A paper describes a structure:
The 20S proteasome, which is composed of layered α and β heptameric rings, is the core complex of the eukaryotic proteasome involved in proteolysis. The α7 subunit is a component of the α ring, and it self-assembles into a homo-tetradecamer consisting of two layers of α7 heptameric rings. Interestingly, the human α7 subunit, one of seven heterogeneous α subunits, self-assembles exclusively into a homo-tetradecamer with a double heptameric ring structure, while the α1–α6 subunits are under equilibrium between the monomeric and dimeric forms in vitro.
In this study, we performed cryo-EM analysis to delineate the structural fluctuations of the human proteasome α7 homo-tetradecamer in solution. The 2D class averages showed a dislocated α7 double ring called “dislocated” and a symmetric one called “symmetric”. The ratios of these three distinct types in 2D images were 23% symmetric, 62% dislocated, and 5% open. The symmetric type showed that the D7-symmetric double ring was approximately similar to the previously reported crystal structure. Compared to the crystal structure, the symmetric type double ring of the cryo-EM map was stacked with a twist of approximately 15° and a separation of approximately 3 Å between the two rings. However, in the symmetric type, the interaction occurred in a smaller area of the two α-helices. Like the crystal structure, the cryo-EM data revealed that α7 homo-tetradecamer has a central pore in the α7-ring as observed in the gate-open structures of 20S core particle complexed with proteasome activators. The results suggest that the twisting and separation of the α7 double ring in solution cause further dislocated and open structures.
Residue numbers in the entry:
A (entry chain A), B (entry chain A), C (entry chain A), D (entry chain A), E (entry chain A), F (entry chain A): 2 to 245
The structure:
């Protein structure tokens, strides 16, 4: 509890140098499950630790993945409603950005403006800043496969392999173990689902379901969801890992 | 009472990661009675636990169901006045959305914008956020039977069977028991009124009245209220359940 | 005193789920006297417990009834000045609503917009929300006799017989006793003044004067005040009740 | 051909004192058929000389009568398209005028503003002034049966019996013969259809069809079209006249 | 050549009563080929006399039919570029009109506003009025099969069978011969293509191609083009007529 | 010289039906040289009859081809300055249109809005309408190879092979001779340069230079100019034709 009076409406700084809304949003991220994203050599594919709680839900729904453009997706974590509001405002802002650019969409300045809108609600006191994270990734030809992760603190870090959520530590160690630039996207995403559901603890956390969505060379550049054969294949691949 | 100074105007985060307005609105929902909604295979029909208190009321009035379009309804719970304000603003926004679309109304982006307006009043300090919930459901042909539940935290979750209100736990277990995709809407809605008024405790809660409203194939796609023969039929069906 | 820090500017929620401005406005209503309204089968007539305090007042003045349209009246309770401001803003809004509609005025969406303006000042912090209540009632032919009661919490409940003010409990029991749909308006309003001035306690409360105003079939659809013969007749009728 | 250079864009006056656009619009009116309107003692009913040309038309369509409000109609003559534009703009202006007034709609200032909009397009040079005429008539209780005829020159003349169109001379003589204030509306409108289709010359003009629409006491104040029994009855009544 | 100085910028009237822009636009319509539209009992189907001139054209292109909504089409004649501008502005205005209405689109006030925009450019002098015609037709269930023809003079006439273009006289006689309300749409549209390409003179006019597009019961309410089997079937049907 | 007083500022119509600005712009087009465009099966490639007059010019400059997007070009004819203004305004409008659309750019509604801006300056009198023509063509994968020709009269006609300029007659006959849909783009564009410089008369017209620019499959979808080897190859191919 660092801060007495500082952390009330902490747009005002404390002499540690820690804006306590950033700790709000980060701890809210580590309250939610661990979703990662990776920038392989001919695609950018995301993955979400989706949590099964009951039978009243809907499969295919409860989706923490969100299309932004034809090949731009949004792998959210944190709080879902503000992330969907960010998805809508980023939809209109990606409309403005493929206005601005002539070719297919160059994710750099796109994610810069999206992170600008993220950090713009972080120095006032009307409502809260966005206590959620999300990952933007685009695959192209004239500019290639790009991946950028907008933190809740507005400092958008790009990655060849990223990790947000609860168990970010083991996830980022295992991402820094893998060959994030070398192999093709398909084996690497099998390894992604494999190792992330190794990281899934089945006792402290409840039941789980695979959540993943393509974009790359074999999917004709479309931001496709992972199909049911490849979904069950990655499920069996993670089960081969978890049986050991 | 998690939060000392955090939960004053809790647009500012606390280091747990829990925006305390969301707990305001959720506990306000569990203070009100339990209303559910279900997405059957040829319709989307809602249901409200309506509470009888006195004879000064009006039957047909005290309606916690609200038409939004010709086949779009709003099954509210929480606080009624802000829910009716949301009904009016969603009426103009559904006007803007059936402006935007060419066919009959595609509830997805509709409920996205409605949940955006829900979460937009959740980071300021002029007045409160909406301490109420509501369910949007549309039945169509070119896009089908769609159901979406906008939480008070702005993360609109769609469902094949949903549940909000006080006794959400037993209600969502019984919804995850039923065949929410398999049987026709009529037997399923009989089972809905049946099991929800099983869940109605007559001692801790006061007297009750059935509240339900159609839209589906037999109702010519009109968002009709359940008629008095089908109302008394579902009453007798729930009484057949409650006699056991 | 539920709420420590919550109830300062309680647009922010407390984890009970009770927006404390609603308790401000409701307790302010139960501080003021008990005024009721009833929707009989060929009219909508209001009634106010008017309190005699001194001889410096003016009879015909101190009116807690307010015309809104030619057949739309406003039976206020709570605080009078904000209720008159609501009367003025509802005058311009009823102007906008009989702009919008072609026939005589359909009170439903009218009272919806009025209750929207009521609840719109309930989530900010510049000045207070409206700590007062009022009843809207319209009698027509193409749409009939309609009655709607806008609470201070913005959830406008319609009634066939309503009751607001201090002694709402005994008043609403006696309204749920009477035949609010069956007899003609004239005998029912005699019973209204009768039973409401039975409910008037002459010891704890000070002296009283009858306040009532017609609209119905015999008054040519005009929102007339109750005339002096019918006023003294209802006074004598309540005295016949109170002599027992 | 009075005017050499004057009548080019005759917003500029000629020293006769005749704005030649008024002669454009009047001669355009006398090019179209003769439609009259009459203000009887408990209604205001219009009538149009409708011209049958071929079988490709639609009966009930080709309507030169236009509803403006629930009891306000528009009996047009001249050019039909600008008259329908005047019908639309008068629809929004009647919306603004039943905004302004509290009771049912007082046609006087309504037709004043409509004639103001008529004459407002008569001193410029972008497009033409309205080369058409129309009759406004309202029947009420608090203000009664009112009839007003807006000329194309903007000087709205009210009438107890009016006449516009081609054979205005014989029509206005026969209107000044009849009892426009004395008898009930039904016999008078039978006499209207009678004498106007006496005035219809079947050789110089082509085939004809009766066009008439009620508003009055028997029609519950609704601006109804004349029903088929009363239509064929007035046809037979005019045939009884024309057989002589 | 009626009018010396009048017909220069003929927003100013001449004392005949004939706005010479209406003669511009009508003679421009009779310069273009004859396209008709008909309102059969379960659909509204259009037809265009398309003129084959060379092999450099594109079949399926040179389309004088234009979709406005999912079941609203635009059968143009006159000048094509201003008709496509009217198609675009009517696209945004139909967006505004299915904003305004709750059910499927009621063509009446739609075509009223479109004809208002037609006549609005007819009294100024910046550029020309629209020297082209078009036909709007909608098929529905709650409001049915509606057909409306907006003339270039802004007086939108609805029809059960219409005809615009060059040989309007023989076309409208043959439309007033046929059973425009009685038979099903399919045989009637075969008769439409039959008789209209009887009316096509192959000597004075050059080569022709069938142009027709459905909307009705068998086409699932979609404004479909006539398929190639039904196109060649109607070609052979017109050839069976023309062989006699 | 059809029209006495009509053709002064001919936004006003003449009773022939010929807006004389369209004849201004068309005769201005036939004053300039003949440029064609063709929609082959895997590309849309343009071609301009460029006229050599002196040595003071610049090769690569005097370009009557204009890039609009990465694969959208503009083959102009008529007057060059207004065509470059149309190129700039179409650049911003194509920015607005690839705002609006999600995939690569769908030329249909693009050219519709561009032709709307063309025809929008054709009914006023401040400055002239655009006395020039231009051809828009886009090659894609999700929507394909599209070609559209915006006339100066605003009626944008799409083509599989088009022709504008001076000798449009022989050019369009030879385009309707060729296989505009069958062969690959490369041989067809060789035939284009071949036959168009057959059509070039070297006596009445002065010296000429080849002007052509690709977009298609071999050019990686880039709107490339024809390279110097393929330029001189098409020159030699046209010389092989012209030697006969």
């Amino acid at each position: 509890s660092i801060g007495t009076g500082y952390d009330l409406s902490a747009s005002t700084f404390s002499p540690d140098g820690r804006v306590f809304q950033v700790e709000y949003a980060m701890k809210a991220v580590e309250n939610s499950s661990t979703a990662i994203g990776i920038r392989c050599k001919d695609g950018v594919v995301f993955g979400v630790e989706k949590l099964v709680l009951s039978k009243l839900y809907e499969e295919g729904s409860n989706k923490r993945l969100f299309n932004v453009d034809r090949h731009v997706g949004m792998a959210v974590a944190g709080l879902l409603a503000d992330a969907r509001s960010l998805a809508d405002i980023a939809r209109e802002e990606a409309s403005n950005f493929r206005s601005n650019f002539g070719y297919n969409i160059p994710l750099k300045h796109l994610a810069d403006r999206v992170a600008m809108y993220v950090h713009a609600y972080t120095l006032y006191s009307a409502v809260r800043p966005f206590g959620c994270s999300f990952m933007l990734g685009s695959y192209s030809v004239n500019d290639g496969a790009q991946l950028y992760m907008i933190d809740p603190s507005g400092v958008s870090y790009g990655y060849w392999g990223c990790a947000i959520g609860k168990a970010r530590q083991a996830a980022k160690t295992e991402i820094e173990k893998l060959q994030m630039k070398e192999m093709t996207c398909r084996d690497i995403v099998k390894e992604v689902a494999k190792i992330i559901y190794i990281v899934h603890d089945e006792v402290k956390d409840k039941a789980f379901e695979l959540e993943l969505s393509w974009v790359g060379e074999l999917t004709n550049g479309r931001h496709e969801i992972v199909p049911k054969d490849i979904r069950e294949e990655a499920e069996k691949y993670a089960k081969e890992s978890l049986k050991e």
